Amino acid sequence: MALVLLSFGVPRKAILYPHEEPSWSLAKDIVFHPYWMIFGEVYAYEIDVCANDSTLPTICGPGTWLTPFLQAVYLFVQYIIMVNLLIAFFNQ
Amino acid sequence: MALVLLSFGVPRKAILYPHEEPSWSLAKDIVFHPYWMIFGEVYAYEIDVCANDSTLPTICGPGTWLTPFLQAVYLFVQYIIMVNLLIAFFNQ
Ligand SMILES: CCCCCCCC/C=C/CCCCCCCC(=O)O[C@@H](COC(=O)CCCCCCCCCCCCCCC)COP(=O)([O-])OCC[N+](C)(C)C
Ligand SMILES: CCCCCCCC/C=C/CCCCCCCC(=O)O[C@@H](COC(=O)CCCCCCCCCCCCCCC)COP(=O)([O-])OCC[N+](C)(C)C
Ligand SMILES: CCCCCCCC/C=C/CCCCCCCC(=O)O[C@@H](COC(=O)CCCCCCCCCCCCCCC)COP(=O)([O-])OCC[N+](C)(C)C
Ligand SMILES: CCCCCCCC/C=C/CCCCCCCC(=O)O[C@@H](COC(=O)CCCCCCCCCCCCCCC)COP(=O)([O-])OCC[N+](C)(C)C
Ligand SMILES: CCCCCCCC/C=C\CCCCCCCC(=O)O[C@@H](COC(=O)CCCCCCCCCCCCCCC)COP(=O)([O-])OCC[N+](C)(C)C
Ligand SMILES: CCCCCCCC/C=C\CCCCCCCC(=O)O[C@@H](COC(=O)CCCCCCCCCCCCCCC)COP(=O)([O-])OCC[N+](C)(C)C
Ligand SMILES: C[C@@H]1CC[C@@]2(OC1)O[C@H]1C[C@H]3[C@@H]4CC=C5C[C@@H](OCCC(CO)CO)CC[C@]5(C)[C@H]4CC[C@]3(C)[C@H]1[C@@H]2C
Ligand SMILES: C[C@@H]1CC[C@@]2(OC1)O[C@H]1C[C@H]3[C@@H]4CC=C5C[C@@H](OCCC(CO)CO)CC[C@]5(C)[C@H]4CC[C@]3(C)[C@H]1[C@@H]2C
Ligand SMILES: [Ca+2]
């Protein structure tokens, strides 16, 4: 469940913030939001940052149409496959 | 789980945005929010768009009182029937 988190957090922080000098924030923001997604916080007004309902209208740029797909793939793994593999673990 | 998504996404985008010329946005918005609902994002201030607490006070029009019902029916299927059919699948 932590590979999948960084499988998703590294492409997204790369696709959305493509001017980042080296920083320690690149160690939180590849791990931060993808962890709070496991608990149902979808950051729905930060998907599709080019949309009109966005809290992030400044992050709109080339390639930022890819993150809705990556996240679709992400939660299907982190909320349906894997977090319900735990449930089946404990129950058995 | 993808019929139910479009069983719901097509009536809602038809009932709420009834002036839409042909567009590629009609291929996202019939699939977008009904997918993030499966993960607990209810878009609670976008149900009942005619209400006073709405983020969508401009979408108020004829027929838009139907979407709270469709969505009630939707999540009962996509969060109680079907997403707990997975759980029972994996556990067994
Ligand atoms: C043994 C079992 C292992 C356990 C797990 C591994 C250990 C956990 C590892 C975590 C990675 C390390 C994170 C800290 C990195 C330094 C951050 C920093 O310096 O600045 C940050 C500040 O913000 C913070 O310091 C907040 C604390 C970090 C968030 C922790 C997330 C935990 C949830 C996820 C955990 C799941 C991990 C999933 C696996 C990958 C950001 O930079 P800044 O610019 O200073 O901030 C902006 C400030 N400003 C606006 C005023 C300008
Ligand atoms: C399923 C039933 C539902 C309907 C289906 C219908 C299918 C028909 C689909 C048709 C897609 C092609 C038409 C869109 C292109 C028009 C141009 C455009 O808007 O470009 C946008 C890019 O947006 C994209 O490129 C959109 C994503 C394209 C791929 C679609 C998924 C592949 C099919 C599924 C397979 C997936 C694999 C699954 C893996 C498991 C750019 O515009 P913007 O976003 O505003 O950003 C630019 C902003 N800026 C200029 C300031 C920087
Ligand atoms: C093998 C397994 C199959 C997997 C599933 C099938 C594949 C997935 C199918 C996907 C349908 C195709 C979607 C893209 C269509 C083109 C969008 C476009 O061009 O414009 C859109 C841009 O926004 C985007 O491009 C965002 C990318 C799509 C979001 C996908 C959501 C995933 C969740 C659902 C996944 C579950 C699917 C459930 C089944 C139905 C919007 O229009 P615009 O005007 O260009 O943008 C506004 C910008 N402006 C405000 C600045 C003006
Ligand atoms: C359950 C226990 C709780 C209580 C029960 C009590 C029951 C009593 C029921 C009473 C219903 C009638 C009262 C309202 C009619 C007055 C007109 C009105 O307000 O219209 C509004 C529409 O809103 C409606 O039409 C409301 C929904 C009507 C159907 C009721 C549900 C069916 C019963 C249940 C079975 C379901 C089947 C289940 C399937 C599985 C219009 O006003 P607006 O919304 O502002 O939109 C207009 C905006 N505009 C003017 C700008 C365009
Ligand atoms: C049956 C299933 C079929 C679906 C399969 C996928 C088929 C579709 C594949 C690819 C779709 C590519 C076209 C969509 C983007 C168009 C808009 C655009 O360029 O937006 C932005 C940049 O966008 C880029 O720079 C994207 C560059 C090409 C794709 C990058 C790699 C992703 C694909 C890797 C492969 C993934 C394969 C995944 C396989 C699972 C900005 O817009 P612009 O236009 O650049 O400039 C401004 C606007 N203007 C110039 C108009 C004024
Ligand atoms: C025991 C079970 C009982 C329940 C069963 C259902 C029974 C109840 C059935 C139907 C309720 C219809 C009345 C409610 C709407 C009134 C308000 C209204 O018109 O709002 C808006 C438009 O609304 C429309 O234009 C709706 C037109 C009629 C219904 C459309 C088909 C939906 C029902 C299909 C069948 C579904 C069957 C489902 C069965 C599972 C706007 O208001 P207006 O007034 O038009 O204009 C403005 C306001 N003014 C003029 C006042 C200034
Ligand atoms: C198997 C896993 C693959 C992924 C991964 O774990 C192992 O690989 C690790 C490598 C790490 C980076 C290494 C070095 C630096 C340089 C530093 O520079 C401070 C400069 C300045 C600040 O202002 C000083 O003043 C910033 C942090 C950064 C980029 C690391 C980020 C986290 C990364 C990407 C880790 C990531 C989680
Ligand atoms: C079994 C399932 C039943 C439902 C469904 O899947 C199969 O049936 C599909 C038919 C699709 C539409 C067909 C043609 C177009 C025309 C295009 O026109 C671009 C015009 C302009 C843009 O500005 C060019 O410049 C816009 C998209 C649209 C309306 C499709 C949307 C998605 C739809 C509704 C699909 C939907 C998910
Ligand atoms: Ca939740």
XYZ file of C-alpha atoms and ligand atoms in Angstrom:
571
model
C 0.000 0.000 0.000
C 3.036 2.317 0.059
C 4.349 1.521 -3.410
C 0.962 2.432 -4.840
C 1.090 5.637 -2.832
C 4.384 6.636 -4.455
C 3.538 5.109 -7.798
C 0.861 7.838 -7.742
C 2.437 10.608 -5.689
C 5.566 10.968 -7.786
C 3.850 11.296 -11.176
C 1.323 13.756 -9.821
C 3.798 16.066 -8.142
C 5.872 15.859 -11.317
C 2.975 16.500 -13.691
C 1.412 19.333 -11.639
C 4.375 21.285 -10.191
C 6.944 21.128 -12.992
C 9.325 23.861 -11.840
C 10.293 22.687 -8.388
C 13.833 23.141 -7.287
C 15.120 20.541 -4.834
C 13.245 20.818 -1.563
C 12.045 18.869 1.425
C 8.478 19.626 0.330
C 9.058 17.078 -2.434
C 9.181 14.460 0.343
C 5.844 15.402 1.900
C 3.789 16.152 -1.176
C 4.586 12.787 -2.761
C 3.299 11.113 0.404
C 0.800 13.539 1.927
C -2.400 13.712 -0.130
C -2.136 10.116 -1.372
C -2.329 9.016 2.250
C -5.391 11.030 3.112
C -7.141 9.599 0.024
C -7.050 6.132 1.627
C -9.413 7.665 4.208
C -11.924 8.990 1.736
C -10.617 12.516 1.177
C -10.654 12.741 -2.602
C -9.612 16.387 -2.980
C -12.380 16.715 -5.474
C -11.868 20.396 -6.208
C -8.185 19.768 -6.924
C -8.660 17.051 -9.533
C -8.833 18.598 -12.994
C -7.059 21.752 -11.887
C -7.961 23.396 -15.207
C -11.676 23.046 -14.435
C -13.802 26.037 -13.487
C -14.604 24.773 -9.971
C -10.965 24.385 -9.011
C -9.205 25.440 -5.853
C -6.031 25.234 -7.986
C -6.626 27.396 -11.073
C -2.921 28.287 -11.224
C -1.685 24.689 -11.521
C -3.289 24.416 -14.963
C -0.651 23.566 -17.527
C 0.596 20.938 -19.958
C 0.003 17.393 -18.809
C -2.297 18.182 -15.876
C -5.169 16.361 -17.582
C -3.483 13.083 -16.622
C -3.940 13.243 -12.864
C -7.682 12.424 -12.888
C -6.810 9.159 -14.581
C -3.905 8.309 -12.295
C -6.120 8.937 -9.297
C -8.994 6.885 -10.656
C -6.514 4.052 -10.983
C -5.116 4.913 -7.557
C -8.216 4.669 -5.411
C -9.577 1.643 -7.165
C -6.387 0.096 -5.786
C -6.215 1.930 -2.433
C -9.910 1.773 -1.496
C -11.374 -1.221 -3.369
C -8.560 -3.705 -3.996
C -6.184 -3.140 -1.110
C -8.199 -1.677 1.765
C -10.722 -4.467 1.190
C -7.880 -6.981 1.181
C -7.231 -5.994 4.793
C -10.896 -6.610 5.636
C -10.658 -10.039 4.088
C -7.401 -10.594 5.918
C -8.797 -9.842 9.372
C -12.089 -11.650 8.768
C -10.272 -14.897 7.957
C -20.618 -0.846 -11.331
C -20.184 1.114 -14.581
C -23.735 0.759 -15.867
C -25.001 2.225 -12.611
C -22.500 5.035 -13.021
C -23.938 5.947 -16.425
C -27.484 5.071 -15.488
C -26.989 8.009 -13.094
C -24.514 10.241 -14.903
C -26.523 10.617 -18.087
C -29.817 11.658 -16.468
C -28.083 14.109 -14.175
C -26.050 15.858 -16.837
C -29.216 15.958 -18.934
C -31.456 17.259 -16.156
C -28.973 19.866 -14.846
C -27.228 21.254 -17.963
C -30.015 21.292 -20.550
C -28.434 23.551 -23.170
C -25.217 21.746 -23.959
C -24.056 21.659 -27.508
C -22.056 18.581 -28.489
C -18.783 18.516 -26.596
C -16.151 16.241 -25.160
C -17.111 17.519 -21.703
C -20.251 15.404 -22.075
C -17.934 12.375 -21.892
C -16.248 13.383 -18.639
C -19.162 14.821 -16.721
C -21.270 11.693 -17.206
C -18.420 9.668 -15.707
C -16.525 12.057 -13.436
C -18.529 12.878 -10.303
C -20.337 9.522 -10.231
C -16.940 7.878 -9.869
C -15.765 10.024 -7.007
C -19.045 9.292 -5.177
C -18.025 5.621 -4.896
C -15.230 6.947 -2.655
C -17.457 8.898 -0.329
C -17.437 12.319 -1.988
C -21.129 13.153 -2.036
C -20.912 16.689 -3.441
C -23.321 17.689 -0.761
C -23.450 21.371 -1.647
C -24.255 20.500 -5.262
C -27.272 18.300 -4.563
C -30.436 20.393 -4.603
C -28.831 23.134 -6.661
C -31.843 25.373 -5.983
C -31.139 25.278 -2.239
C -29.721 28.276 -0.403
C -26.457 26.549 0.579
C -25.570 25.648 -2.988
C -22.281 25.998 -4.790
C -24.418 25.821 -7.963
C -27.114 28.500 -7.638
C -27.118 29.027 -11.414
C -27.992 25.419 -12.293
C -31.434 25.866 -10.728
C -34.100 25.180 -13.311
C -36.923 22.865 -14.332
C -36.364 19.259 -13.372
C -33.344 19.793 -11.113
C -35.323 18.568 -8.104
C -34.906 15.025 -9.441
C -31.171 14.623 -8.939
C -31.331 14.198 -5.135
C -33.528 11.179 -5.707
C -31.409 9.684 -8.475
C -28.350 10.040 -6.283
C -30.025 8.532 -3.244
C -30.804 5.555 -5.437
C -27.284 5.709 -6.855
C -25.207 5.434 -3.710
C -27.428 2.882 -2.085
C -26.316 0.821 -5.084
C -22.710 2.066 -5.380
C -21.814 2.132 -1.673
C -24.147 -0.360 0.050
C -25.166 -2.981 -2.515
C -22.226 -3.130 -4.886
C -19.154 -1.953 -2.978
C -20.174 -4.347 -0.201
C -20.588 -7.099 -2.781
C -16.863 -6.777 -3.464
C -16.133 -7.148 0.259
C -18.215 -10.290 0.335
C -16.499 -11.458 -2.819
C -12.968 -11.135 -1.447
C -13.859 -12.482 1.997
C -15.184 -15.722 0.497
C 8.504 2.075 10.001
C 7.313 2.310 9.117
C 7.470 3.518 8.192
C 6.346 4.529 8.307
C 6.104 5.365 7.055
C 7.259 6.233 6.613
C 7.498 7.410 7.514
C 6.719 8.657 7.145
C 7.477 9.519 6.214
C 7.219 10.754 5.901
C 7.995 11.568 4.956
C 8.739 12.709 5.585
C 7.915 13.938 5.683
C 8.635 15.122 6.252
C 9.640 15.721 5.326
C 10.100 17.104 5.720
C 9.023 18.156 5.545
C 9.525 19.568 5.672
O 10.635 19.819 6.054
O 8.627 20.529 5.322
C 7.192 20.281 5.107
C 6.444 20.910 6.253
O 5.451 19.965 6.717
C 5.825 19.070 7.631
O 6.930 19.007 8.091
C 4.688 18.170 8.005
C 5.142 16.802 8.470
C 5.333 15.844 7.352
C 4.072 15.159 6.913
C 3.969 13.726 7.316
C 2.916 12.989 6.553
C 2.449 11.737 7.215
C 1.422 11.008 6.415
C 1.978 10.062 5.401
C 2.686 8.865 5.988
C 2.631 7.614 5.137
C 3.948 7.170 4.557
C 3.803 6.268 3.356
C 5.073 5.603 2.908
C 5.858 6.433 1.970
C 6.871 20.893 3.776
O 7.849 21.904 3.451
P 7.805 23.387 4.038
O 8.132 24.307 2.928
O 8.599 23.438 5.288
O 6.251 23.523 4.379
C 5.477 24.652 3.915
C 5.595 25.752 4.937
N 5.262 27.152 4.465
C 3.948 27.200 3.752
C 5.190 28.044 5.662
C 6.330 27.654 3.547
C -16.239 5.241 -20.680
C -17.500 5.890 -21.068
C -17.424 7.396 -21.024
C -17.190 8.119 -22.336
C -16.145 7.512 -23.264
C -15.865 8.398 -24.472
C -14.485 8.246 -25.071
C -14.106 9.408 -25.993
C -12.837 10.105 -25.615
C -12.095 10.854 -26.401
C -10.833 11.541 -26.032
C -10.330 12.518 -27.078
C -11.064 13.823 -27.062
C -10.444 14.870 -26.165
C -9.406 15.750 -26.843
C -9.844 17.175 -27.146
C -8.814 18.223 -26.741
C -8.781 18.464 -25.260
O -9.732 18.782 -24.599
O -7.540 18.301 -24.769
C -7.332 18.416 -23.325
C -6.560 17.195 -22.943
O -7.517 16.165 -22.618
C -7.330 14.937 -23.104
O -6.418 14.612 -23.811
C -8.434 14.045 -22.662
C -8.072 12.595 -22.430
C -7.874 11.824 -23.706
C -7.834 10.321 -23.509
C -9.180 9.695 -23.221
C -9.111 8.349 -22.553
C -8.888 7.205 -23.496
C -10.103 6.316 -23.640
C -10.380 5.446 -22.435
C -9.293 4.431 -22.090
C -8.532 4.742 -20.810
C -7.651 3.603 -20.301
C -8.127 2.952 -18.997
C -7.026 2.295 -18.159
C -7.543 1.338 -17.130
C -6.594 19.697 -23.033
O -7.517 20.677 -22.514
P -7.579 21.025 -20.956
O -7.937 19.791 -20.225
O -8.393 22.245 -20.758
O -6.043 21.353 -20.658
C -5.321 22.338 -21.441
C -5.076 23.591 -20.627
N -3.913 24.468 -21.059
C -3.920 24.655 -22.543
C -4.015 25.813 -20.411
C -2.616 23.843 -20.652
C -10.371 -1.317 -19.796
C -11.044 -0.644 -18.636
C -11.786 0.635 -19.015
C -11.650 1.736 -17.981
C -12.810 2.722 -17.938
C -13.032 3.529 -19.194
C -11.993 4.593 -19.418
C -12.250 5.888 -18.688
C -13.092 6.787 -19.502
C -12.985 8.079 -19.609
C -13.840 8.936 -20.439
C -13.085 9.918 -21.289
C -12.761 11.159 -20.547
C -12.017 12.189 -21.342
C -12.843 12.847 -22.393
C -12.234 14.104 -22.963
C -12.219 15.258 -21.979
C -11.878 16.584 -22.603
O -11.364 16.674 -23.682
O -12.196 17.664 -21.841
C -12.370 17.609 -20.381
C -11.054 17.933 -19.726
O -10.857 16.986 -18.648
C -10.089 15.917 -18.877
O -9.527 15.706 -19.914
C -10.007 15.035 -17.667
C -9.717 13.583 -17.987
C -10.912 12.685 -17.894
C -11.301 12.306 -16.502
C -11.428 10.828 -16.293
C -12.086 10.470 -14.999
C -11.765 9.101 -14.505
C -12.841 8.552 -13.640
C -13.829 7.726 -14.399
C -13.336 6.355 -14.754
C -14.376 5.270 -14.647
C -15.086 4.940 -15.930
C -16.441 4.303 -15.732
C -17.002 3.653 -16.966
C -17.811 4.575 -17.785
C -13.459 18.594 -20.062
O -13.705 19.444 -21.202
P -12.779 20.685 -21.585
O -13.675 21.781 -22.012
O -11.710 20.222 -22.502
O -12.141 21.023 -20.160
C -12.591 22.156 -19.376
C -11.429 23.110 -19.232
N -11.758 24.590 -19.063
C -12.646 24.830 -17.882
C -10.475 25.341 -18.859
C -12.437 25.117 -20.289
C -40.099 9.461 3.755
C -40.399 10.167 5.020
C -40.214 11.665 4.923
C -41.425 12.508 4.566
C -42.409 11.905 3.571
C -43.494 12.891 3.139
C -43.948 12.744 1.697
C -44.633 13.997 1.144
C -44.279 14.321 -0.272
C -44.716 15.363 -0.941
C -44.345 15.762 -2.315
C -45.086 16.971 -2.850
C -44.764 18.235 -2.107
C -44.087 19.329 -2.912
C -44.924 19.869 -4.051
C -44.970 21.389 -4.172
C -44.208 21.956 -5.364
C -42.723 22.052 -5.163
O -42.190 22.421 -4.151
O -42.062 21.686 -6.276
C -40.601 21.754 -6.290
C -40.102 20.463 -6.851
O -40.109 19.477 -5.795
C -40.925 18.429 -5.895
O -41.688 18.240 -6.801
C -40.778 17.552 -4.700
C -40.754 16.062 -4.966
C -42.115 15.502 -5.264
C -42.185 13.994 -5.154
C -42.148 13.468 -3.735
C -41.430 12.152 -3.575
C -42.297 10.957 -3.819
C -42.736 10.271 -2.546
C -41.731 9.285 -2.003
C -41.531 8.034 -2.859
C -40.226 8.009 -3.643
C -39.967 6.708 -4.396
C -38.837 5.843 -3.834
C -38.084 5.020 -4.880
C -37.268 3.914 -4.294
C -40.199 22.923 -7.148
O -39.423 23.856 -6.366
P -37.826 23.856 -6.384
O -37.363 22.546 -5.879
O -37.338 25.095 -5.736
O -37.542 23.926 -7.956
C -38.124 24.974 -8.772
C -37.054 25.923 -9.267
N -37.461 26.905 -10.355
C -38.793 27.514 -10.047
C -36.444 27.998 -10.447
C -37.531 26.213 -11.680
C -8.953 2.056 -26.493
C -8.092 2.926 -25.616
C -7.543 4.132 -26.354
C -6.877 5.163 -25.463
C -5.357 5.098 -25.401
C -4.710 6.468 -25.321
C -4.756 7.235 -26.627
C -4.544 8.734 -26.479
C -3.126 9.111 -26.197
C -2.670 10.332 -26.033
C -3.481 11.582 -26.055
C -2.653 12.793 -26.425
C -3.482 13.971 -26.891
C -4.251 14.630 -25.782
C -3.716 15.999 -25.406
C -4.189 17.118 -26.312
C -4.200 18.474 -25.623
C -2.856 18.915 -25.134
O -1.842 18.835 -25.773
O -2.940 19.412 -23.880
C -1.791 20.054 -23.222
C -0.445 19.382 -23.407
O -0.558 17.957 -23.608
C 0.551 17.349 -24.020
O 1.596 17.911 -24.200
C 0.335 15.889 -24.240
C 1.344 15.370 -25.238
C 0.992 14.027 -25.823
C 0.701 12.950 -24.804
C 1.701 12.844 -23.697
C 1.887 11.442 -23.197
C 0.630 10.763 -22.752
C 0.301 9.547 -23.564
C 1.212 8.383 -23.288
C 0.604 7.054 -23.645
C -0.418 6.564 -22.643
C -1.090 5.268 -23.042
C -2.089 4.762 -22.025
C -2.584 3.356 -22.295
C -3.379 2.760 -21.164
C -1.743 21.523 -23.610
O -2.475 21.771 -24.827
P -1.709 21.813 -26.227
O -2.708 21.559 -27.286
O -0.501 20.958 -26.163
O -1.275 23.348 -26.243
C -2.198 24.407 -25.880
C -3.502 24.405 -26.651
N -3.434 24.718 -28.147
C -2.122 24.387 -28.793
C -4.513 23.935 -28.828
C -3.704 26.178 -28.340
C -46.340 6.284 -3.329
C -45.334 6.895 -4.269
C -45.705 8.305 -4.678
C -44.640 9.016 -5.481
C -44.611 8.661 -6.957
C -44.435 9.871 -7.854
C -45.650 10.774 -7.910
C -45.336 12.231 -8.232
C -45.006 12.476 -9.668
C -44.652 13.625 -10.195
C -44.465 14.908 -9.461
C -44.652 16.111 -10.358
C -44.931 17.393 -9.599
C -43.723 17.938 -8.893
C -43.129 19.156 -9.572
C -43.862 20.449 -9.273
C -42.949 21.667 -9.302
C -42.417 21.998 -10.661
O -43.067 21.983 -11.670
O -41.105 22.316 -10.597
C -40.377 22.815 -11.774
C -40.625 22.072 -13.071
O -41.035 20.704 -12.866
C -41.474 20.068 -13.950
O -41.522 20.563 -15.042
C -41.915 18.676 -13.637
C -43.017 18.259 -14.584
C -43.834 17.092 -14.089
C -43.024 15.875 -13.703
C -42.019 15.446 -14.723
C -41.815 13.957 -14.760
C -41.331 13.369 -13.474
C -42.237 12.305 -12.924
C -42.173 11.013 -13.690
C -42.795 9.849 -12.957
C -41.952 9.319 -11.816
C -42.551 8.115 -11.114
C -41.676 7.560 -10.008
C -42.198 6.287 -9.370
C -41.165 5.542 -8.560
C -40.610 24.311 -11.921
O -41.869 24.717 -11.349
P -43.156 24.927 -12.266
O -44.325 25.038 -11.370
O -43.180 23.931 -13.364
O -42.796 26.370 -12.845
C -42.181 27.386 -12.008
C -42.924 27.672 -10.718
N -44.292 28.346 -10.830
C -44.981 28.134 -12.145
C -45.163 27.802 -9.740
C -44.120 29.818 -10.615
C 12.518 3.218 -2.871
C 12.019 4.637 -2.676
C 12.034 5.420 -3.957
C 11.543 6.844 -3.727
C 12.245 7.528 -2.570
O 12.321 6.681 -1.429
C 12.840 5.370 -1.679
O 13.546 7.908 -2.985
C 14.024 8.855 -2.022
C 15.043 9.841 -2.582
C 14.591 11.152 -1.954
C 15.235 12.479 -2.367
C 16.742 12.424 -2.155
C 17.382 13.768 -1.975
C 16.736 14.918 -1.907
C 17.496 16.227 -1.891
C 16.992 17.178 -0.824
O 17.643 18.442 -0.994
C 17.608 19.374 0.091
C 18.006 20.713 -0.480
C 17.863 21.993 0.346
C 16.427 22.224 0.782
O 16.058 23.589 0.653
C 18.848 22.004 1.498
O 18.934 23.284 2.109
C 15.501 17.358 -0.935
C 14.799 16.012 -0.806
C 15.219 15.010 -1.886
C 14.736 15.506 -3.262
C 14.628 13.613 -1.533
C 13.097 13.585 -1.536
C 12.520 12.215 -1.190
C 13.060 11.109 -2.093
C 12.615 11.342 -3.546
C 12.785 9.659 -1.593
C 11.595 8.831 -2.117
C 10.465 8.652 -1.116
C -22.943 1.507 -24.163
C -22.534 2.924 -23.805
C -23.676 3.890 -23.936
C -23.231 5.305 -23.586
C -21.971 5.723 -24.319
O -20.977 4.707 -24.274
C -21.423 3.404 -24.666
O -22.304 6.025 -25.664
C -21.200 6.759 -26.208
C -21.586 7.717 -27.329
C -20.748 8.944 -26.996
C -20.929 10.250 -27.777
C -20.723 10.010 -29.267
C -20.316 11.234 -30.030
C -20.063 12.417 -29.499
C -19.838 13.625 -30.380
C -18.626 14.431 -29.957
O -18.587 15.634 -30.733
C -17.367 16.379 -30.770
C -17.707 17.733 -31.344
C -16.697 18.880 -31.302
C -16.247 19.182 -29.884
O -16.128 20.579 -29.660
C -15.544 18.621 -32.253
O -14.774 19.792 -32.485
C -18.701 14.774 -28.491
C -18.808 13.504 -27.654
C -20.035 12.655 -27.998
C -21.313 13.413 -27.599
C -19.920 11.285 -27.267
C -19.929 11.409 -25.741
C -19.823 10.066 -25.026
C -20.900 9.082 -25.472
C -22.294 9.602 -25.085
C -20.657 7.604 -25.042
C -21.328 7.001 -23.792
C -20.386 6.789 -22.619
Ca -15.764 8.484 3.552
